[PDB]
Amino acid sequence: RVTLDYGKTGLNVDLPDDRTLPPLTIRPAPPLDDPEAEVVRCLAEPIGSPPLLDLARGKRSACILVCDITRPVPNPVLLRPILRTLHAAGLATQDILILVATGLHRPSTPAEKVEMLSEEIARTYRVEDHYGTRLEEHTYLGTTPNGVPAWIDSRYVQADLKIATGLIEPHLMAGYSGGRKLICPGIAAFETVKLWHGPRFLEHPLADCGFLEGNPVHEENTRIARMAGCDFIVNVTLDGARRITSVVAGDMEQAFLKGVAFVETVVKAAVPAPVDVVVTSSAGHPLDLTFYQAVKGLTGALPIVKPGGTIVIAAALAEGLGSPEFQSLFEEHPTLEGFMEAILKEESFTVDQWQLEELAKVRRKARVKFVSDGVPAAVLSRCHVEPVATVELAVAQALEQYGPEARVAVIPKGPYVLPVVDPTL
Numbered sequence: 472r473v474t475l476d477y478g479k480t481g482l483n484v485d486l487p488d489d490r491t492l493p494p495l496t497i498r499p500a501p502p503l504d505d506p507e508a509e510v511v512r513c514l515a516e517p518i519g520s521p522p523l524l525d526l527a528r529g530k531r532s533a534c535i536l537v538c539d540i541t542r543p544v545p546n547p548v549l550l551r552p553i554l555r556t557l558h559a560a561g562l563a564t565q566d567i568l569i570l571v572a573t574g575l576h577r578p579s580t581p582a583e584k585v586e587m588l589s590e591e592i593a594r595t596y597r598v599e600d601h602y603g604t605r606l607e608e609h610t611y612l613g614t615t616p617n618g619v620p621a622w623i624d625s626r627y628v629q630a631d632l633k634i635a636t637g638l639i640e641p642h643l644m645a646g647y648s649g650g651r652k653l654i655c656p657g658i659a660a661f662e663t664v665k666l667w668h669g670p671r672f673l674e675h676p677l678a679d680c681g682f683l684e685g686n687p688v689h690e691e692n693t694r695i696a697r698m699a700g701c702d703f704i705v706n707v708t709l710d711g712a713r714r715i716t717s718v719v720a721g722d723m724e725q726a727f728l729k730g731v732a733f734v735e736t737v738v739k740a741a742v743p744a745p746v747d748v749v750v751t752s753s754a755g756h757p758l759d760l761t762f763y764q765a766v767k768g769l770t771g772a773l774p775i776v777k778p779g780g781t782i783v784i785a786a787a788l789a790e791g792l793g794s795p796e797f798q799s800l801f802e803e804h805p806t807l808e809g810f811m812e813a814i815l816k817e818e819s820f821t822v823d824q825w826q827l828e829e830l831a832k833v834r835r836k837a838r839v840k841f842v843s844d845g846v847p848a849a850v851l852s853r854c855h856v857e858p859v860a861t862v863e864l865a866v867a868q869a870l871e872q873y874g875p876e877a878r879v880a881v882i883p884k885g886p887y888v889l890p891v892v893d894p895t896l
């Protein structure tokens with residue numbers, strides 16, 4: 472028996488005792504007893520930055536970037552200390568904007584802002600959404616040597632004090648989330664993101680979970696974030712039960728890299744050899760709201776599945792497939808091969824196409840069996856995965872296909888784990 476992450480509930484799965492490896496879990500580091508108290512300490516004694524109170528002295532306006540619903544940041548723990556310090560520094564609440572760094576996602580709803588930030592904060596401060604398809608809401612900052620123009624939300628660019636908050640987890644393109652990613656793509660225009668999420672970046676072998684140095688995705692969004700600037704970040708890591716295990720604050724690069732150095736010691740989970748069947752999740756609510764995001768569970772499993780193996784994913788998909796643009800690509804391109812011909816041979820850019828490219832990367836290596844009650848089977852079958860009614864059935868089907876030597880690995884927290892093959896094991 473194992474509980475996979477699945478919406479707000481989890482999912483209780485029975486897996487074959489004689490076939491299944493011990494579950495891949497992140498290392499059990501101690502949670503912080505008082506993470507808000509720790510945030511307070513880190514604001515007074517940050518990494519590579521003056522104390523936030525000293526940074527905020529004499530500033531007339533502030534913009535605080537926060538993640539949208541898809542990231543389970545415990546925002547009030549981070550924001551209450553920040554907001555207290557800004558008030559102490561003399562900034563009035565009307566001088567402070569909380570900007571939801573949607574990237575190219577849809578805007579957060581009023582209810583989501585309350586879920587993300589607490590009723591007290593959502594009611595007291597101006598909270599606005601980034602709109603990536605609205606170029607007019609962005610300021611041009613220059614073009615990188617790789618040819619990517621930097622278009623960043625003007626409300627942030629024009630703020631006296633720039634602050635970003637977030638969460639360091641593995642990421643299938645940028646290696647890890649957090650730090651600079653709140654700026655690029657969090658408040659970057661489609662004119663920027665379409666190129667940065669273009670196949671010239673995404674087909675690179677190091678554009679993958681866990682890779683920073685040498686990953687052009689990370690080199691480029693670091694460069695673009697530095698063209699905008701960021702005076703101060705606060706980032707956390709979360710364990711499997713969503714307790715904060717570390718807080719980093721200060722310089723946008725130095726604090727981020729300190730947080731990554733910690734999370735690298737807990738998120739890696741090794742098997743001695745790749746396996747024919749990998750059971751995984753999309754890390755539950757809120758990440759697994761859409762099929763668009765749940766592709767992350769599929770890419771996360773790739774390092775430990777054998778070529779031609781099967782990934783079995785469970786995800787609640789309570790919000791369905793994703794954006795209208797994302798959904799339209801399945802209708803416009805019934806095969807992944809035709810989709811990849813479209814985007815590889817010409818400069819063809821459609822919102823959210825990058826996740827279809829990631830799904831194509833998955834399907835070049837593995838079959839996928841998809842278990843969900845949030846999207847009908849008939850719909851999922853048009854999404855280049857095989858809908859199966861239960862994980863237990865899906866595993867039984869895969870084990871018959873691969874035979875009596877086949878083994879099962881299981882990753883209950885899905886893309887929040889970094890599975891690796893360690894032959895020395």
Ligand SMILES: *C(=S)c1cc(C(=O)S)c[n+]([C@@H]2O[C@H](COP(=O)(O)O)[C@@H](O)[C@H]2O)c1
Pocket residue numbers: 537538539540541542572573574575576637638642644645647648649650652653656657658664668
């Ligand atoms: C990372 S590539 C990324 C991409 C998008 C797209 O729409 S593309 C959106 N976001 C959002 O930006 C915020 C910061 O990202 P992080 O990965 O959590 O550091 C967050 O609100 C993401 O949902 C990111």
Ligand SMILES: CC(C)[C@@H](O)C(=O)O
Pocket residue numbers: 541574763764825826
């Ligand atoms: C799913 C990916 C492509 C992006 O939208 C993100 O939220 O990380």
Ligand code: NI
Pocket residue numbers: 574656668
């Ligand atoms: Ni993105």
